[PDB]
Write a protein that binds this ligand. Structure first.
Ligand SMILES: [Fe+3]
Length: 499
């Protein structure tokens, strides 16, 4: 293992079974009491075989437990069927996003709450419940038992009732994006308070090109609508169905179709009917939607926009190892807003900007041609892993998005109202900020009355990783928990459970 560099983070991680008391500085308010689980890849080589892509590594879940003003750290591999088969063979024997083999249930991306249960997910129907304390891998769940689909996002969205929504893709001559709702099992007669049994298909929207469905990482949800982009990154289905004959991967069947505009698909959550508009915009890709809401007959969709991503060559392990392959400015994400009229007024003329009357929409336009949408950048400081104050303004007009940078910007708070953005600056270039999680003050009234939990990775053996606690109004540090391990993973998403 190197003393310095991103290569440090691609050596295999070891389990940390007994929760380790971390070193405290500062102090936290009484309402920081709960457990954050963080998902991501931890194992990048097995025996004589190595994974190719960042997204491939075996899921390695960390637990950051907050109690009595202290933090405790532990971490364990998800014991998926893939993990267990690979560990027994001592080689990479099951496929992954970007590596061919030498059931896809390596749920290394994020977590979905259903009732009182927490389910580790990847972009397949095959999930596992995980215990928030012991990090045991519990029962498997096959989401496709309830709705026929081949892939689905690991970014399920939920509402105040705890109902969980997702979009998946069903391949075939019929190819379609299927929109789903899973009713909270606590509010109905169910097998258990964590059962996925109340899952139905709301509706579906056919892919424009049956043999080139879009790749999709996330989507937006408002009070009445689910919205997705048909991105230029397309899965070559004919190539993919042959994968076991030509030794290829899912990622290698994806390409960015450079001559295609983006289409917007919108489904009414409650009617199940597609919004009957043809909506186009200039090409882009987004990993992560932020919040989504309705205002003045329009759907407002915020997201971190990437100009050009190919099929994610930039996130191959070899490319990230060097770190230097971060001078890819077309891959830098920016928080962006598009505003979509949900209807066209009688008498609209070609060239009319349907958003011109709406002063709050200035900077976006929606030109009647079909409607061509023009988005606007809402934060000039590049950011990714967006999060917001879900409890107060999910599906509602809102002011703030928190994200991570990827001089020395670390965490960014975008101000959608006035543009008074805030930044917590990293202390040196051996630090990397992870996804910030907003925890609300129970007695707060403003949208940013709360704190942020920020895991900070390091790429140097002279600096231990830590969890940073920021107050959310001005992003100043109020506490820091330094972890007695050499590394935490270059990970993906976290889930915080107050308790
Ligand atoms: Fe993600």
């Amino acid at each position: 293992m190197e003393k310095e560099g991103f290569a440090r983070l691609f050596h295999n991680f070891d389990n940390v079974i007994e929760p380790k008391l971390c070193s405290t500085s500062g102090s936290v308010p009484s309402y920081l009491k709960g457990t954050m689980l963080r998902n991501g890849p931890g194992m990048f080589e097995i025996g004589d075989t190595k994974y190719q892509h960042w997204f491939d590594g075996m899921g390695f879940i960390q637990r950051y437990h907050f109690e009595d003003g202290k933090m405790y750290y532990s971490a364990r591999y998800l014991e998926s069927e893939n993990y267990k088969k690979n560990m027994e063979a001592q080689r990479i024997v099951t496929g992954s996003f970007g590596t061919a083999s030498f059931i896809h249930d390596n749920a290394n991306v994020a977590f979905a709450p259903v009732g009182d249960g927490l389910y580790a997910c990847t972009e397949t129907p095959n999930m596992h419940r995980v215990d928030l304390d012991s990090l045991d891998t519990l029962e498997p769940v096959d989401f496709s038992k309830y709705v026929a689909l081949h892939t689905c996002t690991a970014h399920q969205l939920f509402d105040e009732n705890g109902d969980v929504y997702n979009i998946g893709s069903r391949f075939g001559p019929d190819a379609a994006h299927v929109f789903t709702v899973t009713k909270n099992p606590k509010n109905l007669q169910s097998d258990s308070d964590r059962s996925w049994e109340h899952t139905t298909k709301i509706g579906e929207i056919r892919c424009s090109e049956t043999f080139y469905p879009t790749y999709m990482h996330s989507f937006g949800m408002s009070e009445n609508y689910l919205i997705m982009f048909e991105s230029p990154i397309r899965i070559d289905i004919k190539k993919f169905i042959m994968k076991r004959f030509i030794t290829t991967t899912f990622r290698d069947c994806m390409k960015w179709h450079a001559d295609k505009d983006v289409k917007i698909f919108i489904l009414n959550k409650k009617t199940g009917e597609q919004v009957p508009l043809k909506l186009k915009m200039a090409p882009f890709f987004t990993f992560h939607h932020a919040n989504t809401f309705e205002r003045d007959g329009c759907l407002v969709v915020d997201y971190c926009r990437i100009e050009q991503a190919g099929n994610f060559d930039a996130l191959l392990i070899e490319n990230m190892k060097t770190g230097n392959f971060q001078n890819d400015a077309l891959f830098l994400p920016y928080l962006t807003r598009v505003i979509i009229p949900l209807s066209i007024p009688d008498g609209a003329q070609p060239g009319d900007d349907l958003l011109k009357p709406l002063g709050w929409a200035k900077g976006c336009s929606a030109i009647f041609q079909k409607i061509r949408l023009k988005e606007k950048r809402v934060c000039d400081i590049s950011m990714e892993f967006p999060r917001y104050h879900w409890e107060k303004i999910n599906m509602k007009p809102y002011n703030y998005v928190y994200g991570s940078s990827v001089t020395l910007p670390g965490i960014v708070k975008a101000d959608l109202e006035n543009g008074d953005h805030k930044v917590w600056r990293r202390e040196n270039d051996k630090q990397i900020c992870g996804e910030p999680i907003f925890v609300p003050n129970p007695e707060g009234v403003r949208e940013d009355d709360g704190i942020l939990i920020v895991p900070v990775m390091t790429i140097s053996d002279g600096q231990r990783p830590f969890v940073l606690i920021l107050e959310a109004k001005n992003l100043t540090e109020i506490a820091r928990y330094t972890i007695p391990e050499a590394r935490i993973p270059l990970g993906f998403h976290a889930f915080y459970q107050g308790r």
